[PDB]
Amino acid sequence: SYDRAITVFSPDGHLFQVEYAQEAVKKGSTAVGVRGRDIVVLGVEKKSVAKLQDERTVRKICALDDNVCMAFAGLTADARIVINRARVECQSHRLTVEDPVTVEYITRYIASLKQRYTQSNGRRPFGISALIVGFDFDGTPRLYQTDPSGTYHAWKANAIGRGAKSVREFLEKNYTDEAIETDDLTIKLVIKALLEVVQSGGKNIELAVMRRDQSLKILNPEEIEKYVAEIEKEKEE
Amino acid sequence: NQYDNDVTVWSPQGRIHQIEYAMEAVKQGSATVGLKSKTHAVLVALKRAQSELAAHQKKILHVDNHIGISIAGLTADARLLCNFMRQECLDSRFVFDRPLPVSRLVSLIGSKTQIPTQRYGRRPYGVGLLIAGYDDMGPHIFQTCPSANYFDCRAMSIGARSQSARTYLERHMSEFMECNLNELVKHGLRALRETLPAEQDLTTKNVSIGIVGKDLEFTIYDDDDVSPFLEGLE
């Protein structure tokens, strides 16, 4: 079996394989997460459009358990591996603790999986970041982010993938108690945030919500373009 | 150049650069001195302190009641080797109910440390040891190297500027056999002091001492416990 050391240090303390995995993430479709007051929302760009595609089969938003879901940006095949590993783990937790995972527990687990693939022989790092959202047993809403290095943090809102710099700038100016006071406004904040980067708005924004206890709902194109117009016409005034 | 990255690559002059390079790890450690009389084996070591507020690195380690070591080079490799030596000593007392003879333990270090010098992707141990022991053949000072070679010594110094210590030790070695313990440690300290910049002196913060002999299990002296030995370097 293959034992080559793949992720190694360079002069100045760089881990080049990890930096390169991070470049793969920067070329993924834009993903956005906002933690609301009693809701969490994930929105993600495109990726390709293409009329002949079966839309169902390429989603970048994914249930991990009833109370935790995730979006990713980067190498989609890599993301699938992470997602399935996390899904298995959620069931082990339930098995041995008889509670669902906290969002932090499963984030911590995904992050340490990723970190291991930066320090084990024979393997390259995963080329993905993840936005992980849900609710803890006591109702507290949560948004976490992981990256290829295994680092993770909690966020009020965030973006990953292409144009994440500019979307994050927008969330910084626009994430207020007012902007998330209600469910529709929280959803609108995700869409406005994408509508800044999303090439042919929009059209190709996929979007999903999780409510306290209520489990992942994906919005359909009919439900989305309701919000799109309801915001596009408000910005004329 | 093409010959210096792998311990399995002989150079065209019949050298192994990786082993030579591992030996530089020991030349850059802080100096330690080992010497012996008819009855005792002594180790003396200089401790390098990182900053003024750091304690000073341990240089001397207990192996068994009859054996201790002084280290120079990579500390993590020193501990790995020290743990090997400890285990070999415990095994011998478990099996035979007597101390492992010092020369036999040193043979085991040679055999153990030679192995990674001959396999691809392994590396030499980057540590040299001075080994003080006492057994049926009396006191001993042995030296081990990253090359896996080892030496039975009247006295020895390794580490930075140890050439001065070696010289002092040659100058006075004909005295050592007949020295009492105090004279012998004094000699060890004088040799170690030769390694220091003209400014600087032996202090209770930077000197560590290890002693074993006929009447005495391997004992380590640090900090306030070295003051008896430092006073009356007269």
């Binding site: 079996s1 293959y2 080559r4 793949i6 080049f16 394989q17 390169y20 995995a21 991070q22 470049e23 793969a24 993430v25 920067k26 070329k27 009329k51 002949l52 595609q53 079966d54 169902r56 089969t57 390429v58 980067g74 190498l75 989609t76 095949a77 890599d78 699938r80 591996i81 399935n84 693939y117 024979g122 393997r123 390259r124 790092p125 995963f126 080329g127 | 691809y120």
Partner: protein, 248 residues
């Protein structure tokens, strides 16, 4: 030995996996292979490369593989690699049937193989498999289905798609002619020939030069059939007759 390791499973400086990309170039040169979804079934149509006169014609197809009772596939790329993968697909499908006593849903079979391909890009120091696959099938969850997978371990569902030589061109023609929700197997067959005729531009299209398989449902049972040459000639005839109308 580090000197001789070409390092097939590492990132490049742009976050790229060169062996995967290079494998995708291999595929681009292989025989053109298309898949079309209809309301009453699904088809595969592929360019044959085994066309030399002295070849012997011993199996029921060249590049169409039955996977289990309800599914088939075709391939573009390294043939021997495709034989390893199609053998693995059959194994997975029987493991599923053993365990659950029901056929593997189409997307589940595709995903299981794509996880093997993904592994080959992440660990093991091996070259990836030089294959893209088109998968056709029926299951009780989503009925008639068409999937595409490639050496990265990525896949997707499609209503019509193409891999191998002149794919980009083929997909433009499909984009233009395909009627979502309104295709029959008969019209998809017509479109398939139309597409191959344009994309085998070296040269004049012959039944000996293509293979078509269809997948349909009859009396609660999946039927998977490779069209006989008489039927392929008849379809080519009808396409040429159709272009006779084209101006007046």
């Amino acid at each position: 030995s580090r000197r001789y390791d070409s390092r097939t499973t590492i990132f490049s400086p742009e976050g790229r996996l060169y062996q995967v990309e290079y494998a995708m170039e291999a595929i681009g040169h292989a025989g053109t292979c298309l898949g079309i979804l209809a309301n009453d079934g699904v088809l595969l149509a592929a360019e044959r490369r085994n066309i030399h006169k002295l070849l012997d014609e011993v199996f029921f197809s060249e590049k169409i593989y039955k996977l289990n009772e309800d599914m088939a596939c075709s391939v573009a790329g390294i043939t021997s690699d495709a034989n390893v993968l199609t053998n693995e697909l059959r194994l997975i499908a029987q493991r599923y049937l053993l365990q659950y006593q029901e056929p593997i849903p189409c997307e589940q079979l595709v995903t299981a193989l794509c996880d093997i391909k993904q592994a080959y890009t992440q660990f093991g120091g091996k070259r990836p498999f030089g294959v893209s696959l088109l998968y056709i099938g029926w299951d009780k969850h989503y009925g008639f289905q068409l999937y595409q997978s490639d050496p990265s371990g990525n896949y997707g569902g499609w209503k019509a798609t193409c891999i191998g030589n002149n794919s980009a061109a083929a997909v433009s023609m499909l984009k233009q002619d395909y009627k979502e929700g309104e295709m029959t197997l008969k019209s998809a067959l017509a479109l398939a020939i139309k597409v191959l005729n344009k994309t085998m531009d070296v040269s004049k299209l012959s039944a000996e030069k293509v293979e078509i398989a269809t997948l349909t449902r009859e009396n609660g049972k999946t039927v998977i059939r490779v069209l006989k040459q008489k039927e392929v000639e008849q379809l080519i005839k009808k396409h040429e007759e159709e272009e006779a109308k084209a101006e007046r």
